[PDB]
Structures are given as C-alpha cells and as structure tokens.
Design a protein around this ligand. Structure first.
Ligand SMILES: [Mg+2]
Ligand SMILES: [Mg+2]
Ligand SMILES: [Mg+2]
Ligand SMILES: [Mg+2]
Ligand SMILES: [Mg+2]
Ligand SMILES: [Mg+2]
Ligand SMILES: [Mg+2]
Ligand SMILES: [Mg+2]
Ligand SMILES: [Mg+2]
Ligand SMILES: [Mg+2]
Ligand SMILES: [Mg+2]
Ligand SMILES: [Mg+2]
Ligand code: NA
Ligand code: NA
Lengths: 136, 76, 116, 50, 236, 66, 177
RNA sequence: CGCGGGGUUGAGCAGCCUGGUAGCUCGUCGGGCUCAUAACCCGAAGAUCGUCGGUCAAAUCCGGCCCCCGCAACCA
RNA sequence: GCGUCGUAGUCCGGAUUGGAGUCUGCAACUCGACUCCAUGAAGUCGGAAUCGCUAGUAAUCGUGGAUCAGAAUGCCACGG
RNA sequence: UGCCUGGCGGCCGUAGCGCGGUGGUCCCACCUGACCCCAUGCCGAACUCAGAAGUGAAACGCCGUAGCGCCGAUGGUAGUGUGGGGUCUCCCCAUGCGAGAGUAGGGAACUGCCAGGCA
RNA sequence: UCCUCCUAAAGAGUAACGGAGGAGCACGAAGGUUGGCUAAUCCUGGUCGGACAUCAGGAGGUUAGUGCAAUGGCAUAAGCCAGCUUGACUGCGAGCGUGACGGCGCGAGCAGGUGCGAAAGCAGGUCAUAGUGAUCCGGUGGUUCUGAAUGGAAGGGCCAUC
C-alpha cells in the first residue's frame, strides 16, 4: 500500500512539521497538483486519490506520485491505560509542507487534466491548487 | 517492555580551551578516539587523553596533510 | 615503487625525531653516490653537508658508491660538524636498511667525534 | 570463567610471590618468567606454584 | 579394499638374532576372512613376526608372499609413539577438519567421536590421558588407514571389561583378516579362529580352530605333564 | 638461493632416437632415454595428419565397381 | 643456458626490424615463470599436497611454496589457513633453462599433440597453459606417483600489447596454430 | 494477547539436552508361502526436522513470521 | 601325451558397441544368419522359498531330423 | 645572477587525476654480475653488495591544453538572540546576527636551507 | 548492577513501565620492542575447477580488518607477517578530570634493576570505553612491631593473598 519495505527502525518520534517544501516545481510532466496547506497524508489517501485521477483519464498519460509516506504512525489499543510502552505501528504518513507537488501528469489536454486533479483534490485533507510547468 | 537501560555519562569533551594558561600535567581533552592528535608539548594517555607536558598556552591547530586537528602548547 | 614505498617506511622515525626536537643526520644512498647532511630542529635550514658528488672528496676514491666511499663521506661529515659547534646528533635511517654502506657511513662518524 | 588464580612463587628462597590467572586446561605446562624480587632487589626467575 | 584368495602365505621362514633362533622352518597360509590368535611365552618372537610381515625386518630363510589385494595396517606394541604436547583431536586427525577413513572422508570430529571421545573430552592433551584412554586414542589414530589385514599387537593393553567387550564384539564383524597377538586367552576364546602356538627350540605350530578344539586336539593326542610350579622365592 | 633445501641441479644429458644429445640442466642424476623429440616434433605433423574426417561419397563410389 | 643467448642475439635484432622501436630496450622481455598446482583435494589428507610438492620439486629445481586459502568460502568447504595449492617461481638464467627444456622435451611428449592456442593472451602479452599430466616431464617413472594430476604454466612478459607479445613467443619457435 | 507449550517420514512418537552420528512401531511398494485372501517370511523406498533469517559446526542457539494447544481476566 | 598360465575380475567371462564383410532372397532400415578386426560390461556360487532324479538312471559331451529360400539356446531322437 | 637536478622542509587538490609533447654532459632509474656479510615461510621480484657498455622504453621531472576532481562570490532564501502581535499543533512586525545549495566566475600551484651540471 | 547509541535543545549534566543493542570474559601470547608488509570487490587468461578455492596482470582505493554490542578512532597504521623476549617490574609521584561521600580515572618525572634496538628511543599489559561486590568474620605465606611478674609461647598488629 505504497509503503516502505525493510526499513531500518520500526518506530519513530512524533517530530514537528514546520518549514516549507523543496519539490515545488513541475519536473516530469506538464501539469501538477501543489499543496497550499500544511498537514499530512496517509497511505490510504494517496491510493484513494490516485484511483480517482486514473478513472478520469482512464487510458492516457503517465502519472507521477512525487510523495511517499515512509513514516510510521502508531496507536495504542482501545481501553488501555497510559504508559506501558509505545504503541504499535498502524499506518504510514507523508508530512506535507506548503508548496510540495503531490501528483503530476503528462500527455493530457488541459481541460481534462484540470478536472482530473479536482476529483482527486476532494479526497485529500489539505487545500490543493493547480500548477503548470514553467521553463524558468 | 524489553528495553529501558542505559549507561552512566562518561563526561568527555574539551576541558581547557584556547588561550588558557595551564600547569604541567593538566588534562586538556578527555577523548574516545583521537579526534585531537598530540602536538608538541602535549602527551597522549592510554585512554587517549591529551595532557599538558609544560605550562603555557593551549593552541589548537589544523596542521597536516589530512587536515587533522592538533593541540600544542605555546611556551610562555 | 622504490621511493614511494621507502618514504612511507621512514615517516614514523622521521616524525618521532621531529617531536623530540633533535638535530638529525640524514643519509641518502644511491647506486652511484651517497649523501649525508645535518639539519636543524627547524627542519628547514641545514648546517653541514657532505656528498660523493662533491669533487674533492670523490677525487681520492676509485669508484664512488661502495663501502669505502661512504666511510670517507661518513668521516667527512663528522669533520665539518665538530667545527660548527655540533657534537650531539641522532642518526636517521631514512628508509634504507642499516646493514651496508650506511652502517659504514655512520660508524666512521661515530668514531670521528659524534656522540650517538 | 575457566581461568583460575595461580601464584608465581619466587626462586631466591624468600617469601615473595606474584599472582595471576592461568588456563589450567589448555596450558598444562607450568609457567616460569623473570620478575623483580623487591626483597633481594634483583631480577630472578619466578616459578609456578599453587 | 576387497581381498582375494592370497592372504600372505609364508614359506620356510627362519629367524635368528646372532645365534638365538626364534623361529625355524615355518610354513603356513592364512585363509580368507579369518582371525588368528598368537600365543606363547615372553620374548618368543611374536612381535618379530609382525615386524617381518610389515616389512621392517627380513627373513633369514624362506619368503613371506603377500597377496596383491592385501592392505596392511599393523598396530605397534607400544603406546610410546604419540607426542604428549598435542591435543587428542589434533593428534588423531592431523589438524584437518575433514580427514578420510578408507575411501569415504567423513568429518574428523565425528570420526573421533565414534571412539567415545566427546567434544569436551576432545581438548585434553594426549600426555594428560589415562592408560585406557591412551590405548583407545592410539588405536583410533592407527586404525584410520582403512586396511584389511589388521595386525593387532595386544590391543587389550589397559582395557576395562566393557571397553574390551566393545572391541571384542566389533572384531567378530570384520570383513578383512585379523591377526591378533595377546596373552589373555579369555579374550581370544571368543574371537580366535586360527591358533599360532609357540613352543621351545623355536618351534611354531599352526592350528585351525578355537581353543576348545585345540584342547580337543591335545586330549586326542595327549601327554601326561603337569608339574609347572616350583616357587623359587627371593631371600635365603 | 637458500641452499640445502632443494633437490640437486645438474647438466645431465639424455639421448633420443634421432640423436638429440643435449646437456639439459635437470634434476635426475641418472638419465632416462627418450622417444621422439624436437627434431621429430609433431608440430608440423600432428595437425597435418589430423585432417582425415569428412568425405564419404568417394568411399561409396568405389563400391560402384560394377 | 641456451635460449638466453638466443634471445640476446637473434630475437632482439629481428624484432627491431619487425616492430621498429626507436630504442633497443623497448623490445618486450619475458621475465618470470610461475608454476602452480592447485590441489584442493588435500583438504581430506595432507600427504597429497606433499606428493604434489615433491612433483613440482622434481619438475623445477626448487622447493615449492604452498599457498593457503585467501578467503573462507563455504561453497568449496574451505577456509583461510588451509594449504590448498603449491607454487614455484623461476627468474633469470635458471628460468631460461626450464623454459628451454619445456619446448625441447615436454611439448612434443603431449598426448595427441597438435599445437598451442594463440588466442590465450590476457591482452597484455602474458601466456598460460595447463598440461593435465605431469608425465610429459621425463622425471616420473610410475613408481612414486599416485595420480596423474597436472600443472599450470604462466609466462609473464613486459609486452604492453598482445600483438607485441605475439612475436615474443613466436620468435622462439613455439607450436602455435 | 497478557503469559506459557508445540510444529520431525504417509499416521503416532523419539532424538532439541547443550552441536559434529535421521531413528522407532504401523503403514506404501516388490517378491515368497496359499485354491484365493488375511496373517506370517524376505527385500526396498521416502523427511527443505513449520518458516524468514542470522554459530568451524544445529533438528538442537537466538530473534522474527505462520498456525495450533492451554492458562488468567481479582477487589469494588 | 607333451607345454604355458600360478589365483588375478586373470590368458576367466563374451554382453554391448564401431568398422570390414559372405550368403539366401524381388528385396536383410524398422527385422536374418554366419565370418574377421577392435571393444571386453554385469558376474568371485547367489534372501525368503523352491525343482528333478533309485542304474546305464542323475551329471556332462558331441551328432542327427522334422518345420524350412534363409532363419534353434526350443522340440523330437542317437550314441560316449 | 640565469636556467636544470638531488636531498630536507613550509602549507595540504586554485596544489590532485586525465590527455599531448619532451630529458640524459652532470644528476637520476631501469640495467651488468653476484661465490662475498646480507636476503627469499620458492624466486637477486624485494632487501644487499661489486660496477659500468646501452638505455631515456616504463617511472621521475618539466612545460601545454579546461574531460574531471577542486575553489567560489553579490543578491535572495531558510534559521535564530531580544521586544511586541496574531485566525496561535503555525506564523507576522522592530532590531541584531545570517547560512546550506545553486549562478557568474577562478582554476595546470606558490615558497626557504643547502649541495651539484652548465652558460 | 555495568557498557554503546538516540531522546539531550552545537561545553558538561539531564526523566518516563521512552526507541534500539550488549556484559558477569579471553590472552603467557592476542603483551614489549626491532625489522618487514598493506585490504573488500570486479574483469581478462589458465589442468581437473564451476557463480565462488590456487596462479598471472589490470581497474580499484579501505566498500577490508580489529578476540567478543555500538559509538569514536586507526596508513607513522591501533590491521597483517617473523626474531629475540617478560616493563602483564618494585617504591614514589609534580599536576589534573569526575563524584554528596565511599571511591574511580589520566599522569610527565625521580630511584633500583630489566628487555628490545647500531643508536635516538620505547616498554609500569591488550585501539579506548563493560567483563563486577564495601565492612565484619575466618584461612595461608613473610615480619621477634607487640608479648599482662621475667624469659618463651598463644593471640594480636603490618605486608602479600584467598
Ligand atoms: Mg564387479
Ligand atoms: Mg578367484
Ligand atoms: Mg534337414
Ligand atoms: Mg532351415
Ligand atoms: Mg546544551
Ligand atoms: Mg551535550
Ligand atoms: Mg592486540
Ligand atoms: Mg613497526
Ligand atoms: Mg601491537
Ligand atoms: Mg577491545
Ligand atoms: Mg610474659
Ligand atoms: Mg601474625
Ligand atoms: Na613383543
Ligand atoms: Na593409569
């Protein structure tokens, strides 16, 4: 489920999520989906959104997923007192800072690409926008 | 819960800094490897500790073909 | 290589002597000549220099580059050194094995007024 | 642990001995070394003992 | 190796040391698949026979004729051929993790373990060994040639009852030929099929059978003589 | 050389059927006579007589002596 | 030796006109012969290695140096410090002597011999070949040999190219295809 | 899942015991005896020792994965 | 009767395979017999069990015939 | 004074790799021989000794060139000490410090004690 | 109870039933000097021999190794190979580091003898950091220090050690 195989450590600290993003430019295709807000994306949501874009185009153009969770989030069981160790790993998440480009496509006309991403933006917690590749 | 053990801190680091007047035999750095190599007028113990060999001033230098830090004592 | 594997063979002794800060008498042997000089604890400026390429010392020797030549140089460097106020030195192997015409060189210097 | 304590008695006849640990299994041969004897003030040979 | 009909016959053998004759005009032929017990007094040539069989000596007369299929493996009469400054495993194998017995190899550790030398008792130096353990180890080291004409010279040196019976039951199953020299006739009573009896003047006589059948031979051609002891004593 | 840890080296001589008497430096001490040698060397012969495989129609045509 | 003077007199003069170097000593020279017998089977018993060592001592007038395993590998059930091969090195005049007697009285003795493959060059003028039987050397009389284990011979030359090294072994009348 | 135990020929079991050495009884297959079958006699075959893996050396140690079998869930 | 081999997988064994062939036959590929040269394998007396034979018999040796263009280690007979 | 060479340093890639050309009067390596002290877990390959005919072939040293390695601004950005403010799991304003990466661009080292050729 | 890393906020220290691993040893050589040497991996050629054993030469440049976890180190090697060896010495110790204390650690140099080296020099254990247990009571060696009227002795004391 778009999840790392054979990591180095099973459990990780909570950390923080300040700062900005680095992969802010369209690099593989011509259209991309930025990330206006700051949050985090589950592995379930990445696949749920990808299935939404694919069913829109349904034959044409590559899709790149520039983001990858590789961070384990743990949960304590139901009706369990505090302490007694750290919780067990449940799902994997990908922290998102503003500007990060999540998905991006190629070979699709603009109008179809515009609505393909919108059907995916409805599945993601964070506010997202549309960006076109620039020569720079 | 399986883990939960640790060792007492060994209190390493630099004990006298640059421009500090030392007496003979005083410890300059407590070391694990050799991050600081023994320059002139300093020694090197079995614990890789760098002790002064003459009273003076501590001077850190970066002499060497591999840019390895050296500590030497100016005679004053 | 000859020189590449020899300079690394003499680095340890050359650095330890530098730490002690003593004047060292270094020998450089060649299949045709041999050299010996004394260099201050500075490591840069020299005091006494004798070699077989020098014309006067090599005139009296049949073939410069044997045991006989080196002892003539080994005695010769001692001659100059004692006239420069120098008595105590530390012989430096410089990589060459202390067996042949370097043993001959230093031994004559040892018997000609150098205390090492 | 298989190393057991042994003592190196002296050989000058005085009462003086060092102590050490020796593998009596893989080294059945007895030890003898040259150590300092501070009673007679000399380097004498120290033989193995109980 | 498989062995055929010729089992090193011996013809007109005569041995002497100066003038002291041990054996004169001896001739026999060991059959195939047999065990031959040798009996006689002390210093009557029993070890000398194995010596000349194994090529160490030469016969003053006659010739011993080996079979070409015969593999030789002779056990020395004395344990004093090991080096006391070596471990058991090293002494037997030769410092090899895998050695070979006969033709197939199998690991050295297992080969020694087959002689009841467990992994712990593996580590003792052969100088630190009881008499029976030393005998067992020497036998184990020498029996690795994988031969088939086993010339045992008193394997019952320092063997307990159970140690003795283990080899006593293992020998009866031997395919090859076994020549055994011993003094305790009770051990041979269970394994011997041919008999070599020594006598006076250097007389060696062959016989086919066990000791009860030897007694039967004596009783069939008997002689009245039982006055063995005289009790010389020591002090006047 | 390190001396006295080697078999003895000499200049022994052997002889072949085509003469071939050469004082070859070898460690034997009692020479062994030899078969054909470099003067009968099968380097101009062996490959030239190798080629005998292939060609059987001419083998059959001889049977048509009828 | 014999072929040393041959190299001094004929080979260099021929090669100067052949490949046309501007200096005499730019001509390739063959400098060492290394003979190795990799037993491997000596894992079971040591005596085999000593027999192979005596064999090489017979072929070349030197005591072989036995070589142990460089790496512990489980594929062949060996580990470091296990004597696994034997080796001999020949330099100078006594190298020339063995090299001469090789092409004199051992190559023709090869069973069903036709020649030596010419494309057996590692790209820098170094040659090697296995014999598969020690009996090509006349110092074995089927009296002490238990097996017919062979040997590998290597010839190391200063030829910077295999084309340069061609007319090195060719000039000595080697049996090439 | 909080705690323990187990996994070996087709079936049931040893051998884990401190590593160098895979066995047992039944059963499968082929002959024999018998009019024929059972019984009986003779001769064979086969097991990645659950799995991922990490001690010269393991079935044997250790960690994990899988499945199964028990035990405890008390005071209010 | 005179020789050799001296107990070995052999001067035992004669399978299998490669060449050369002779015949009968309209025709020897699937599928004949015989000859020559080379090759020279299992096999060192056989588990459970089981068969024949009471005198010219058992055991061993050779010859013959029927069938048939050719094709017997089988069958039917004969003697030592 | 100038050019060239050997030894000992200074500082450690702006100094090291790659490719092209090039040197043997002296210096330098290869080379010649090795019974001699010396050496080879075999070997004059290495270490070592006795020499001089050829050699500048490989290395070494010189120059030459931007395929590399390497160095690298200005501006901006991230961050952060102190004081305030917000919709406050994050930020903004005043002030002080201010990177890393990347762009331009720089880049075939500089140097002091001796001895030895030469002119 | 002890050792290594992170949490730990660029000196030191810093908690939780926070996240991950080890120790209760070994070595008379695996210690001391004096000489010498330098790895993993890949390619080409080569007798059995292959994906991988030994040999040769090229790329390679520490991805190697450390007596055993991890971190910091290591080419002058602290890694690898031999000779002779016992400094794995006795009495001290300027001066420092770290502890609430008990204690623990580093140490040039001095004296007496010692090994290695031609010497200059190095050596008071092991590349370092775990491999541990106070006091009381008792055991075994040395020492007339003491010895309950005196001379001895028992028993104490001091040094070494269990
Ligand atoms: Mg057979
Ligand atoms: Mg037979
Ligand atoms: Mg008829
Ligand atoms: Mg017919
Ligand atoms: Mg801090
Ligand atoms: Mg800190
Ligand atoms: Mg060590
Ligand atoms: Mg050293
Ligand atoms: Mg060391
Ligand atoms: Mg350590
Ligand atoms: Mg009293
Ligand atoms: Mg007392
Ligand atoms: Na006897
Ligand atoms: Na006893």
């Amino acid at each position: 489920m778009l999840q790392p195989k054979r990591t180095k450590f099973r459990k990780m600290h909570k950390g923080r999520n300040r700062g900005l993003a680095q992969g802010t430019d369209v690099s593989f295709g011509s259209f991309g989906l930025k990330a206006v807000g700051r949050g985090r994306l589950t592995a379930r949501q990445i696949e749920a959104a990808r299935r939404a874009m694919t069913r829109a185009v349904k034959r044409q153009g590559k899709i790149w997923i520039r983001v990858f969770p590789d961070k384990p989030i743990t949960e304590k069981p139901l009706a369990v007192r505090m302490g007694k160790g750290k919780g067990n790993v449940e799902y994997w998440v990908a922290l998102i800072q503003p500007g990060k480009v999540l998905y991006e496509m190629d070979g699709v006309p603009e109008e179809l690409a515009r609505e393909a991403f919108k059907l995916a933006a409805a599945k993601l917690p964070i506010k997202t926008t549309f960006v076109t590749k620039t020569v720079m | 819960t399986r883990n939960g053990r640790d060792s007492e801190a060994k209190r390493l680091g630099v004990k006298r800094f640059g421009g500090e007047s030392v007496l003979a035999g005083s410890i300059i750095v407590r070391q694990r490897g050799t991050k600081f190599h023994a320059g002139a007028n300093v020694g090197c113990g079995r614990d890789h500790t760098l002790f002064a060999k003459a009273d003076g001033k501590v001077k850190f230098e970066v002499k060497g073909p591999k840019n390895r830090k050296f500590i030497s004592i100016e005679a004053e | 290589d000859k020189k590449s594997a020899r300079i690394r063979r003499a680095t340890r002794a050359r650095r330890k002597l530098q730490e002690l800060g003593a004047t060292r008498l270094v020998v450089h042997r060649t299949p045709r000549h041999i050299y010996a000089q004394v260099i201050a604890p500075n490591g840069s400026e020299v005091l006494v220099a004798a070699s077989t390429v020098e014309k006067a010392i090599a005139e009296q020797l049949k073939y410069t580059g044997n045991k006989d030549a080196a002892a003539a140089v080994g005695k010769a460097v001692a001659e100059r050194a004692l006239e420069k106020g120098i008595k105590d030195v530390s012989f430096d192997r410089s990589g060459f094995q202390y067996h042949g015409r370097v043993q001959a060189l230093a031994d004559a210097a040892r018997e000609a007024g150098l205390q090492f | 642990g298989i190393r057991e304590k042994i003592k190196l008695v002296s050989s000058a006849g005085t009462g003086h001995f060092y102590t050490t640990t020796k593998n009596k299994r893989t080294k059945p041969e007895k030890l003898e070394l040259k150590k300092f004897d501070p009673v007679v003030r000399q380097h004498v040979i120290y033989k193995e003992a109980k | 190796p498989r062995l055929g009909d010729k089992v090193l016959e011996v013809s007109n053998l005569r041995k002497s040391y100066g003038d002291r004759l041990l054996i004169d005009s001896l001739s026999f032929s060991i059959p195939k698949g047999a065990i031959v017990g040798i009996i006689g007094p002390n210093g009557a040539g029993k070890s000398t026979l194995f010596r000349m069989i194994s090529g160490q000596e030469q016969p003053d007369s006659g010739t011993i004729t080996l079979g070409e299929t015969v593999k030789l493996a002779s056990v020395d009469q004395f344990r004093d051929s090991m080096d006391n400054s070596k471990t058991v495993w090293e002494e037997v194998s030769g410092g090899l993790d895998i050695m070979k017995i006969g033709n197939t190899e199998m690991p050295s550790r297992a080969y020694v373990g087959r002689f009841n030398f467990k992994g712990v008792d593996q580590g003792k130096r052969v100088g630190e060994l009881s008499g029976g353990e030393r005998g067992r180890l020497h036998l184990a080291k020498l029996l690795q040639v994988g031969g088939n004409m086993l010339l045992l010279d008193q394997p019952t040196n320092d063997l307990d009852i159970e140690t003795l019976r283990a080899l006593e039951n293992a020998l009866l199953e031997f395919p090859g030929c076994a020549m055994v020299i011993s003094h305790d006739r009770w051990f041979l009573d269970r394994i011997a099929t041919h008999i070599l009896d020594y006598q006076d003047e250097g007389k060696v006589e062959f016989f086919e059978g066990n000791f009860t059948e030897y007694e039967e031979y004596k009783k069939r051609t008997l002689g009245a003589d039982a006055l063995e002891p005289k009790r010389i004593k020591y002090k006047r | 050389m390190k001396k006295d840890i080697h078999p003895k080296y000499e200049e022994i001589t052997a002889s072949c059927s085509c003469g071939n008497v050469m004082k070859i430096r070898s460690t034997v001490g009692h020479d062994l006579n030899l078969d054909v040698c470099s003067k009968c060397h099968p380097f101009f012969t062996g490959k030239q007589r190798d080629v005998a495989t292939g060609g059987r129609v001419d083998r059959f045509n001889k049977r048509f002596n009828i | 030796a014999k072929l040393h003077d041959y190299y001094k007199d004929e080979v260099v003069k021929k090669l100067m006109t052949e490949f046309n170097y501007n200096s005499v000593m730019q001509v390739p020279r063959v400098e060492k012969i290394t003979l190795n017998m990799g037993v491997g089977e000596a894992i079971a018993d040591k005596k085999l290695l000593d027999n192979a060592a005596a064999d090489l001592a017979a072929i070349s007038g030197q005591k072989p140096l036995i070589t142990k395993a460089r790496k512990s590998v489980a594929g062949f059930k060996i580990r470091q410090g296990y004597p696994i091969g034997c080796k001999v090195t020949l330099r100078g005049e006594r190298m020339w002597e063995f090299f001469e007697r090789l092409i004199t009285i051992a190559v023709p003795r090869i069973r069903d011999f036709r020649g030596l493959s010419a494309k057996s060059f590692d790209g820098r003028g170094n040659y090697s070949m296995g014999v598969r039987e020690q009996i090509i050397f006349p110092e074995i009389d089927y009296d002490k040999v238990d097996r017919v284990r062979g040997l590998d011979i290597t010839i190391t030359t200063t030829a910077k190219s295999d084309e340069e090294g061609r007319a090195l072994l060719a000039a000595f009348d080697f049996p090439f295809r």
